[PDB]
Amino acid sequence: MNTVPFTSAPIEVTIGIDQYSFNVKENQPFHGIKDIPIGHVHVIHFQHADNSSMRYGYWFDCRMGNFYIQYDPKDGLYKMMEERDGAKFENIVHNFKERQMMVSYPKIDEDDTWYNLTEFVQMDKIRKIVRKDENQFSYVDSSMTTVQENELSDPAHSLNYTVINFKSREAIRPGHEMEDFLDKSYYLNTVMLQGIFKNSSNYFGELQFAFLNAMFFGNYGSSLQWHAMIELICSSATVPKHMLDKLDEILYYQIKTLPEQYSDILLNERVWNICLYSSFQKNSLHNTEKIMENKYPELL
Amino acid sequence: GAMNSSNYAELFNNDIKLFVDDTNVYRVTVHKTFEGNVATKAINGCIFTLNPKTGHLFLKIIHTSVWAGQKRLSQLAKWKTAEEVSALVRSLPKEEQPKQIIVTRKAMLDPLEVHMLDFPNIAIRPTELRLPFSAAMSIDKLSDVVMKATEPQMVLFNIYDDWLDRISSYTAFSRLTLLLRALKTNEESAKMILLSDPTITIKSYHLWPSFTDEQWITIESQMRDLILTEYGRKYNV
Ligand SMILES: N=C(NO)c1ccc(C(F)(F)F)cc1
Ligand SMILES: N=C(NO)c1ccc(C(F)(F)F)cc1
Numbered sequence A: 001m002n003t004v005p006f007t008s009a010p011i012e013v014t015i016g017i018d019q020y021s022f023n024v025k026e027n028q029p030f031h032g033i034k035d036i037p038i039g040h041v042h043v044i045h046f047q048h049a050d051n052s053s054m055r056y057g058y059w060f061d062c063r064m065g066n067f068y069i070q071y072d073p074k075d076g077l078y079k080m081m082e083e084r085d086g087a088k089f090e091n092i093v094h095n096f097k098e099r100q101m102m103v104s105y106p107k108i109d110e111d112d113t114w115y116n117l118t119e120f121v122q123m124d125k126i127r128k129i130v131r132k133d134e135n136q137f138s139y140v141d142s143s144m145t146t147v148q149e150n151e152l153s154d155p156a157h158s159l160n161y162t163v164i165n166f167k168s169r170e171a172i173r174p175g176h177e178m179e180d181f182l183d184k185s186y187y188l189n190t191v192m193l194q195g196i197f198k199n200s201s202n203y204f205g206e207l208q209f210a211f212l213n214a215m216f217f218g219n220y221g222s223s224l225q226w227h228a229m230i231e232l233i234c235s236s237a238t239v240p241k242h243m244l245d246k247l248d249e250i251l252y253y254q255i256k257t258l259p260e261q262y263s264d265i266l267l268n269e270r271v272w273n274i275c276l277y278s279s280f281q282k283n284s285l286h287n288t289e290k291i292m293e294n295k296y297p298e299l300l
Numbered sequence B: 001g002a003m004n005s006s007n008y009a010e011l012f013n014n015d016i017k018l019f020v021d022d023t024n025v026y027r028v029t030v031h032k033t034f035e036g037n038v039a040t041k042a043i044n045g046c047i048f049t050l051n052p053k054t055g056h057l058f059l060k061i062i063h064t065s066v067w068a069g070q071k072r073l074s075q076l077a078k079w080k081t082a083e084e085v086s087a088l089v090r091s092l093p094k095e096e097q098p099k100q101i102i103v104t105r106k107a108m109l110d111p112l113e114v115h116m117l118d119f120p121n122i123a124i125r126p127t128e129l130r131l132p133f134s135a136a137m138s139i140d141k142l143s144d145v146v147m148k149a150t151e152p153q154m155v156l157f158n159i160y161d162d163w164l165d166r167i168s169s170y171t172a173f174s175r176l177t178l179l180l181r182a183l184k185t186n187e188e189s190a191k192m193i194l195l196s197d198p199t200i201t202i203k204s205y206h207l208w209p210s211f212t213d214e215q216w217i218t219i220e221s222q223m224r225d226l227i228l229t230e231y232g233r234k235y236n237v
Helices: A086-098 A113-118 A123-129 A147-151 A177-182 A185-197 A200-217 A220-234 A241-257 A260-266 A269-278 A286-295 B005-012 B073-091 B106-115 B133-138 B140-148 B169-185 B187-195 B213-235
Strands: A002-005 A013-017 A020-024 A032-036 A042-048 A056-060 A067-072 A077-082 A138-141 B017-021 B027-032 B038-043 B045-050 B056-062 B100-103 B123-125 B153-158
Touching (some): A002 A086, A032 A086, A042 A077, A056 A077, A113 A200, A113 A241, A138 A200, A185 A200, A185 A220, A200 A220, A200 A260, A241 A286, A269 A286, B005 B169, B045 B140, B100 B106, B140 B153, B169 B187
Antiparallel strands (some): A002 A032, A013 A042, A042 A056, A056 A138, A067 A077, B017 B045
């Protein structure tokens, strides 16, 4: 069980760690988060009390180094940084743990929510979407735009998601215009799965990463990417049977976890109605359709 | 964006553009079967592709063999239209290719856009105007060549005859849309107006009668009255 220590908390802030969150007061004696489960990526995220503009945060994996948070008064944010001196990290954390100045990652033992939301997410692939190679952790915030958004303006600060565009030469074989537009199986299976992603595990991981950035940061471009990746599967008549079953589980946990009060902005009516009621896979998402109908029958 | 009354004069500027109407592409007669069910039988159709500035009409005849063994024909018809329009553009020399294609029905937007992906600089636009191009098959010579076709065929016409020698393309398009609206609202009466004097002949190389300028005024007046009447006979006014 690993630990993300905090140098201090000089400004009042709501701190999130995965799906949990707690309020820290200005200069409250808070020195970090312990008992973080090993084996998963994690995200630690922030919303300042004074300026709710810019939710921001850091994706990280404690297996990859010793990370900590120190507030920067010049840039005005809580920054993640890696401590390369292992002895200093052990000693500072030991003092902090002995004075019980840390909250404990509050994982109920029955609870697989975080595993289910991050099953296919890897930092090595996350670093490809968020390019900042001098760090082992990845910064994301509410405002960052995606490559596809920029094409339609600072490239170093962009989310490099896989570009999906149903009315593009990549998606449409010359001579198969109607066929490929109405059944996207060749775009899904040949172009994307065989060509780009290399396997469905990579397809699911980016899709999951796109959702989590939408939910935690309100990142609109990420919500666009999530929906596009769902629509591409649902609009394909030919999808491996293991993929459909896994997609149903993936989406079920995403819909389960979504704050009820954010469904209006995070869920696209057209995509979900098309996917659940009109598409080739309208009958293949039983768990997702059942939770959507009992939780958001209005959207439908 | 969409073409409407506010930007109407754009049709007659010097940027090449085409209207595409797919109304008459998939045409059926619905009838009873021996068992008392209903079935359709297709008949030849056409794509109506028109340059509103020059009057050049590219009439692609859609022979019933193109539907053989196909399903969801109304959907296929939109994609066949887009295929044939794209083929036509590719067949034209670059300096004759349109800079915009205006579809008369919004359901043609995605099929045409997808078929024209190779032409990113050609704008595909809808329109808010309720254009009467469905009535093209009420023009006897157009109807004749469509029904007689035994194979896919493209036939080229100038839908304005020689009118552009004497009037502008705005005026010619207005005359054409008036004639077609009349034929659409009451075909028999419109044809009576155009054809009840056999001495005003249609030239072999034309579609409409050889009216003098003054006769065109009288004809146009008669067409307006017919349209307003039918709007009367319809809504009772
Ligand atoms: N200010 C620092 N270094 O100069 C510093 C403060 C705290 C840590 C921690 F152990 F918590 F990770 C690391 C570095
Ligand atoms: N192979 C990929 N395609 O880019 C890919 C796989 C996983 C992720 C993740 F979000 F999970 F980090 C991102 C990308």
